[PDB]
């Protein structure tokens, strides 16, 4: 079926946990031996949220090369997406080894540092100019450039270098900050403009290495911003753009990593991001 009917249709019907069941029922299993590793313990924030072996990020190290991240390639679209989980206080440094080494240029993240009254996250980039960061464990130093503050989120540049080589790249940190703590958005406009800001910086091109995206798990809201724009390119790229299929698109990434949308609002909201996008393209 077509996508804005059957919404309305699955509206009527009060049918979206029965949808979203399906999904969790046909939804790939694959091995995650690394990530359930004794010595990998401390590098999990959720012990039931790990990437699959065979699309797992490897950190180029040969003590201990694992990280919770994970390689969605999405084959017709072609885009890619680096999905992780928000870093860790014993794994802010293989964070920022991994953005060098796959080359990235942006960051995008979908949390706050605290919400609900916990840490969702460590604070893991530079508050001030003059109160940089070093990272011993990876041998990397990372200084706040310059902060542009907006209602619904805030961009920053950062440097980030590598200390053995002397080696210095630009990369661009997208902060969506008023995702609320309980439930999704009401409308899904002020996520869409921000989706585009990040297009538009060049950030999700061809030219640079993957988007790195993350919120507290990297599965829900994550899973949101990729599937939303994964979606709407293909509308683009199409002789036929009803012929686009959201639940099959996010059976396909779920090859990649599992659960992405957490629940049946998250589904729901990523219909109505892909609906109401798909009018302001033309
Ligand atoms: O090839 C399409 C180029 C222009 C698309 N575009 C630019 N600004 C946008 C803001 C929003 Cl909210 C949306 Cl949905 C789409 C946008």
Same mark, same amino acid.
């Given at each position: 079926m077509e996508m804005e009917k059957e919404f309305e249709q699955i509206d009527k019907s009060g049918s979206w946990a029965a949808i979203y069941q399906d999904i969790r029922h046909e939804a790939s299993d694959f091995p995650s031996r690394v990530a359930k590793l004794p010595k990998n313990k401390n590098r999990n924030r959720y012990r039931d949220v790990s990437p699959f072996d065979h699309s797992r990020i490897k950190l180029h190290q040969e003590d201990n090369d694992y990280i919770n991240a994970s390689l969605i390639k999405m084959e017709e679209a072609q885009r890619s997406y680096i999905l992780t989980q928000g870093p860790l206080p014993n794994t802010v440094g293989h964070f920022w080894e991994m953005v060098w080494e796959q080359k990235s240029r942006g960051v995008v993240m979908l949390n706050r540092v605290m919400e609900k009254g916990s840490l969702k996250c460590a604070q893991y980039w530079p508050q001030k100019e003059e109160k940089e960061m070093i990272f011993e464990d990876t041998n990397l130093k990372l200084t706040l450039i310059s902060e542009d503050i907006k209602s619904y989120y805030t961009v920053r540049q950062l440097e980030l270098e590598n200390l053995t080589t002397q080696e210095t790249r630009e990369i661009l940190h997208f902060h969506?900050?008023?995702?609320?703590?309980?439930?999704?958005? %009401?409308?899904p406009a002020s996520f869409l403009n921000f989706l585009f800001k990040v297009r538009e910086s060049g950030? /999700?091109?061809? %030219?640079?290495?993957p988007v790195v995206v993350h919120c507290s798990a990297g599965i829900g809201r994550s899973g949101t911003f990729c599937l939303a724009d994964t979606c709407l390119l293909l509308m683009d790229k199409?002789?036929?753009?009803?012929?686009?299929?959201i639940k099959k698109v996010l059976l396909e990434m779920r090859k990649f990593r599992?659960? /992405?949308?957490?629940?049946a609002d998250q589904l729901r909201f990523s219909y109505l991001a892909v609906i109401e996008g798909a009018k302001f393209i033309m």
């Open positions: 969506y900050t008023t995702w609320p703590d309980f439930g999704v958005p %009401e409308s950030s /999700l091109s061809p %030219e640079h290495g199409r002789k036929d753009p009803s012929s686009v299929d599992m659960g /992405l949308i957490q629940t």
